[PDB]
């Protein structure tokens, strides 16, 4: 019967919740009480990239920490050179409604997608020197919200159809499909080892997925509204979520609990992007307050603010070497903060 | 450097292309459409010449782009903000849905369901200044429908005769009262006209008015 399984199912949530309390020995805030603070983090706009004629939704750094990508509703995908602020490529999109970007780890490929329900992959290194579109991954039924390359052939995408998928670019078919989210999936983050990835959905939950098996290992709750951004800790043993509850939370994968909440009474708008520092000591979160805060990731003390944007800070990414932090916004400008 | 020097020539060649393209996109007109499944959005589109479908047409020396985004079937709370600043929001409701009901819900009339969508868009935090064009379709079938059935089925209150003239009028007005941004945005309601096809011309005029009136707004000459 439905009630047999339901009265059963609500019990299974109890042992999960019962065991999590038993493993809640002491709060990270108590353990990190005597750590010396990070001090005022004064970070200034070094470079400002101009050339977008609409609001920016997505940006992604390169693995060489110098090039980066950005997409906007103007239907242009631009590859920047952050050092010399000069445009390397300006890719016209078939669909002006783009909500995500990814720059391949090898830098041979770039991918974008949005309301057109397609993940388009553009080839950068092309004999005829004109970025050409390679493949169009059309297997989703809702807007694509995120996409992250594993290799030049594997890309994992999260969509508004409550499902994530792992693709094979050569064949253009979903190698694996991740199901179990009861709300629209907003963002995903890959583990450093590229064996696991966590996804945040509109159902106020984050799920840890396994890329090979295709089954969800753990599910984290605690937020009150949509989860809009997610990133792993550098060591791949923790991750942070940005929600519309104007709180960032640091979850652990081994302890399977929540550690911190980064909430401030002053802040009432929703978090749009989150990202870490190379050491994992700073958690940069791009709010709707038009500004971007920098949190002490082990003290939960707002040490630093990056207020330079007219409109909301849509995307926010840090370099692999951690020498810079770049924030996009709806004001059509990318700013490099160092 | 000799190489870096040619590099900044590329960034200037890129920027030229971006400008020419930016100013071409500006002259094109951006209309968002919404509506019920049986609204007649399909019928409106025919008159005008999966995913978000876009349609392009030119009329009286002006270019129009209609974004039928009704096929998204996801949560509108996350993706509607992308349309902030479209010229105008065409909206379609079928007048002949007053006596029906959705086969899935219990007793929420289709017409009451249409209002619910209209309420949430006309008062959406993202379209405060955006004007709304409201098309009311199936006016013909509504004439013949109202000649046999009463309107009291859907609206309990009706100080009015079962004549098309008055019957339609009450509904239109009933829709138009939904907006709390009375002193910001203009709802230009039109009844779908079969033969003249001037549904297109009404939009043309409604947009120029939205433009000319808007020009009046930012310029404070109003």
């Amino acid at each position, epitope marked *: 019967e439905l009630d047999q399984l339901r009265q059963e199912a609500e019990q299974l949530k109890n042992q999960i919740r019962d065991a999590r309390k038993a493993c809640a020995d002491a709060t990270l805030s108590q353990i990190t009480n005597n750590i010396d603070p990070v001090g005022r983090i004064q970070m200034r706009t070094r470079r400002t990239l101009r050339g977008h004629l609409a609001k920016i939704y997505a940006m992604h750094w390169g693995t060489d920490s110098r090039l980066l990508v950005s997409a906007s509703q103007d239907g242009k995908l631009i590859i920047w*050179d952050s050092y010399t602020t000069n445009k390397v*490529h300006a890719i016209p999109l078939r669909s002006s409604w783009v909500m995500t970007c990814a720059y391949a780890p090898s830098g041979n490929y770039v991918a974008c997608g949005g309301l057109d329900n397609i993940c388009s992959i553009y080839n950068l290194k092309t004999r005829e*020197g*004109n970025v050409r579109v390679s493949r169009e991954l059309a297997g989703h039924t809702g807007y694509l919200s995120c996409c992250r390359f594993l290799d030049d052939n594997q890309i994992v995408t999260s969509s508004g159809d409550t499902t994530c998928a792992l693709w094979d670019i050569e064949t253009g078919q979903q190698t694996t499909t991740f199901t179990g989210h009861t709300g629209d999936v907003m963002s995903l983050s890959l583990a450093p080892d590229t064996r696991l990835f966590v996804s945040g959905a509109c159902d106020a939950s984050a799920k840890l997925w396994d890329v090979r098996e295709g089954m969800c290992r753990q599910t984290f709750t605690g937020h009150e509204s949509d989860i809009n951004a997610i990133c792993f800790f550098p060591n791949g043993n923790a991750f942070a979520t940005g929600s519309d509850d104007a709180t960032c939370r640091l979850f652990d994968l081994r302890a399977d609990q929540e550690l911190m909440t980064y909430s401030h009474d002053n802040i009432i708008c929703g978090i749009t992007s989150v990202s870490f520092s190379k050491s994992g000591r700073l958690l940069l979160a791009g709010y709707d307050d038009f500004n971007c805060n920098v949190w002490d990731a082990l003290k939960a003390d707002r040490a630093g603010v990056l207020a330079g944007h007219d409109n909301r800070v849509s995307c926010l990414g840090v370099t692999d070497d951690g020498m810079a932090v770049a924030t996009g916004s709806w004001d059509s400008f990318l700013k490099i903060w160092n | 450097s000799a190489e870096d020097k040619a*590099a900044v*020539e590329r960034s200037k060649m890129i920027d030229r292309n971006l400008r020419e393209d930016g100013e071409k996109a500006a002259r094109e007109v951006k209309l968002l459409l919404l509506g019920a499944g049986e609204s007649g959005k399909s019928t409106i589109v025919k008159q005008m010449k999966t995913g978000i479908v876009e349609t392009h047409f030119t009329f009286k020396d002006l270019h129009f782009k209609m974004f039928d985004v009704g096929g998204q079937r996801s949560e509108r709370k996350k993706w509607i903000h992308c349309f902030e600043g479209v010229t105008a929001i065409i909206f379609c409701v079928a007048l002949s849905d007053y006596d029906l009901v959705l086969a899935e819900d219990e007793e929420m009339n289709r017409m009451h369901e249409s209002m619910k969508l209209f309420d949430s868009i006309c008062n959406n935090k993202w379209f405060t200044d955006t004007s709304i064009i409201l098309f009311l379709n199936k006016k013909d079938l509504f004439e013949e429908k109202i000649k046999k059935s009463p309107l009291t089925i859907c609206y309990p209150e009706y100080a009015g005769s079962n004549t098309y003239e008055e019957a339609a009028a009450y509904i239109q007005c009933q829709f138009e009262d939904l907006n709390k941004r009375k002193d910001t945005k203009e709802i230009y309601t039109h009844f779908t006209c079969a033969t003249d096809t001037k549904n297109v011309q009404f939009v043309f005029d409604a947009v120029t008015d939205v433009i000319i009136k808007n020009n009046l707004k930012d310029c404070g000459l109003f």
Partner: single-chain antibody, 232 residues
Framework: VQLVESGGGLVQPGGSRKLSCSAS????????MHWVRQAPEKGLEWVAY????????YYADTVKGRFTISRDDPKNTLFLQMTSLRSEDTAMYYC??????????????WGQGTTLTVSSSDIVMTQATSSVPVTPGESVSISCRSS???????????LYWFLQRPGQSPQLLIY???NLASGVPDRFSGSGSGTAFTLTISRLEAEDVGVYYC?????????FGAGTKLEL
């Protein structure tokens, strides 16, 4: 992606002839083109250059004000207008394409060039090795010397390498020191700093025997070096 040029042949001195290079199979409108000439017995020598969209036109010392270079983007052609040819303009005129953006490979593709026989503050690159004997399966190193520190401030040593097999157009091997071109085996490698440069081949074959060239790109007019022919 082939490049072919038209013109050349036999011209009396003082005559004005035109060279047309019809690009085919690549985005010609976004490629900075060059011209490089090779004397019948001597090495390469840069002459001209046009940037993307005809924004920047440069020339060599021997052809300044004598040559006019133009491109026709819609027709995918490149033109060279030569005026009052001298006896010292007898050379094979290759056409080279190059694109400049972060991490690009300029001078990657070379035309077949045309034969032209007229009737009758500059960096100098020096390599004093010629007709060096070598056997297949051995390791050979080719050394180059500059008169100026090619290592720019940003750390880019704008030194290139080329390989011209007998009876073929020159082919890029190394577009900057410690970099490897596209479609060239891993055997070729180059390590150097400032004014000292080397090209190391681990194991060679009958296919890569020929003459090698060294070019700098720190500043115009892109002076080349003398040849370094591998003898086999």
């Amino acid at each position: 992606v082939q490049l072919v040029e038209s013109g050349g042949g036999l011209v009396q001195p003082g005559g004005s002839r035109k060279l047309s290079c019809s690009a085919s199979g690549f985005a010609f409108s976004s490629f900075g083109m060059h011209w490089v000439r090779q004397a019948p017995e001597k090495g390469l020598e840069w002459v001209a250059y046009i940037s993307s969209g005809s924004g920047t036109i440069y020339y060599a010392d021997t052809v300044k004000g004598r040559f006019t270079i133009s491109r026709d983007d819609p027709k995918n052609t490149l033109f060279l207008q030569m005026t009052s040819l001298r006896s010292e303009d007898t050379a094979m005129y290759y056409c080279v394409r190059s694109i400049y953006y972060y991490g690009s490979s300029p001078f990657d593709f070379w035309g077949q060039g045309t034969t032209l026989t007229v009737s009758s503050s500059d960096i100098v690159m020096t390599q004093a090795t010629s007709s060096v004997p070598v056997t297949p399966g051995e390791s050979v190193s080719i050394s180059c010397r500059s008169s100026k520190s090619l290592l720019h401030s940003n750390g880019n040593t704008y030194l290139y390498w080329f390989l011209q097999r007998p009876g073929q157009s020159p082919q890029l091997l190394i577009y900057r020191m410690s970099n490897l071109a596209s479609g060239v085996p891993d055997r070729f490698s180059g390590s150097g700093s400032g004014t000292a440069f080397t090209l190391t081949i681990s194991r060679l074959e009958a296919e890569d025997v020929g003459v090698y060239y060294c070019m700098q790109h720190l500043e115009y007019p892109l002076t080349f070096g003398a040849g370094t022919k591998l003898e086999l």
